[PDB]
Design a protein around this ligand. Structure first.
Ligand SMILES: Nc1ncnc2c1c(-c1ccc(Oc3ccccc3)cc1)cn2C1CCCC1
Ligand SMILES: [Ca+2]
Ligand SMILES: [Cl-]
Length: 429
């Protein structure tokens, strides 16, 4: 008899899903993936619930201060999100010491500003203070800082998870959609803000009938679908009849390119710009890990969420279909696209980010650029760009692909650009 508990409020919007409130307990009847069958103890109704909107009762995930599967760097982004304060904290699974936990606390450093420190847990952080529940631990450091950089305020502001997409609805009939606003148009099709079945806001990329084979595309989209990561735009659905529509999560702030050239983007200081590029390299290290290739990495193909999360779009799309200024020389001269020619692209994108969306090689024609690279010319370091950031770009732009670093390596550098390794975690007497 498995009882679970609602972590958030949820309105049913389908045929057989249940409505419930934060606090409602439910009897799990079946665990079918993203949707589970359950019985609400509040309504006595049997139906479907999003499996990620609940956890087992008295389990750690029930706890406001607890965050499952969150990385040191993402923990750090969540505690620096609006609505937090000094002392804002959380406890999460540790990445390095697997099966163990860590505490992350919001701080103000004299030199650095608002930061987030991290401590390990073994339960104790320190010998002079042992506890038997993490809840025990938490209240102690809420009651004055027995060592820490700050005393524990209130738990981290939590996001509400995305609704899982309707069950068995990878292929949808065109009729389920209303394409309400054209967001972008181009050579290959359009992008629209849309609504699915009157309940869900989505984006749709409408593809113009092309090369093409629908059966060859649909085979690629199945692959695209399996590439699931916080830093890739999520594919929800596809309309299989020409013209093909691709349905994805909507991204409130549109493209990174358009966002950087906006007023809100102009206010973004360098460390945030870097954070962006680190988010992207994370997404790219994933793609690299899956032995996939992007083939069109640039700011136009990064999307931005309302809460400034950067997401990779159009991955592997180009295989199925003139940005030579983002294109590695071996991709231009021989059509040899690899994860390494993506690295090259990432370099240009990095320069794009730091110059708030400015066009690469400003005032240079595509041919002018190609000849320039042949002489070994590269874009010069802009004003606001730190030397070490510029060095990463130069490494991305090695003539030899194999001398270009990995995204895994790039991610690890970008991620900790302002933190010395020894300073990633804290020491406590
Ligand atoms: N999902 C989106 N949300 C908001 N704006 C979007 C998108 C998307 C989007 C939607 C679907 C899509 O389709 C794929 C996603 C991943 C992999 C392959 C195709 C790609 C981009 C584009 N834009 C454009 C509009 C003009 C500038 C930015
Ligand atoms: Ca420096
Ligand atoms: Cl019951």
């Amino acid at each position: 008899r498995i009882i679970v508990v609602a972590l958030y409020d949820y309105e049913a919007i389908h045929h057989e899903d249940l409505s419930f409130q934060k606090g409602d307990q439910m009897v799990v009847l079946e665990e079918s993936g993203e949707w589970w069958k359950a019985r609400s103890l509040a309504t006595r109704k049997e139906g479907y619930i999003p499996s990620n909107y609940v956890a087992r009762v008295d389990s750690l995930e029930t706890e406001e201060w607890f965050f499952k599967g969150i990385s040191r760097k993402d923990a750090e982004r969540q505690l620096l999100a609006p609505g937090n304060m000094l002392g804002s904290f959380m406890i999460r699974d540790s990445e390095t010491t697997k099966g163990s936990y860590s505490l992350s606390v919001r701080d103000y450093d004299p030199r650095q500003g608002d930061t987030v420190k991290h401590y390990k847990i073994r339960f104790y952080i320190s010998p002079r203070s042992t506890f038997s529940t993490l809840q025990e631990l938490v209240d102690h450091y809420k009651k004055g800082n027995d060592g820490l950089c700050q005393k524990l305020s209130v738990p981290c502001m939590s996001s509400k998870p995305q609704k899982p997409w309707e069950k068995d609805a990878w292929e949808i009939p065109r009729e389920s959609l209303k394409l309400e606003k054209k967001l972008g148009a181009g050579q290959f099709g359009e992008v629209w803000m849309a609504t699915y079945n009157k309940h869900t806001k989505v984006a749709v990329k409408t593809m113009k009938p092309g090369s093409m084979s629908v059966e060859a595309f649909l085979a690629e989209a199945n692959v695209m679908k399996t590439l699931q990561h916080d830093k890739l735009v999520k594919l929800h659905a596809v309309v299989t009849k020409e013209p093909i529509y691709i349905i994805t999560e909507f991204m409130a702030k549109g493209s990174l390119l358009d966002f950087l050239k906006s007023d809100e983007g102009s206010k973004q200081p360098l460390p945030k710009l870097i954070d962006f590029s680190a988010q992207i390299a994370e997404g790219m290290a994933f793609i690299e890990q899956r032995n996939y290739i992007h083939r069109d990495l640039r700011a136009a193909n990064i999307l931005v969420s309302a809460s400034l999360v950067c997401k990779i779009a159009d991955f592997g799309l180009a295989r199925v279909i003139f940005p030579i200024k983002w294109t590695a020389p071996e991709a231009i001269n021989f059509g040899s696209f690899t994860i390494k020619s993506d690295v090259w692209s990432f370099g240009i994108l990095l320069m794009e980010i730091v110059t708030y969306g400015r066009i690469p090689y400003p005032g240079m024609s595509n041919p002018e650029v190609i000849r320039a690279l042949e002489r070994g010319y590269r874009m010069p370091r802009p004003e606001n760009c730190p030397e070490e950031l510029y060095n990463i770009m130069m490494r991305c732009w090695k003539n030899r692909p194999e001398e270009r670093p990995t995204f895994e390596y790039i991610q690890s550098v970008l991620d900790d650009f302002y933190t010395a390794t020894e300073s990633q975690y804290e020491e406590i007497p």
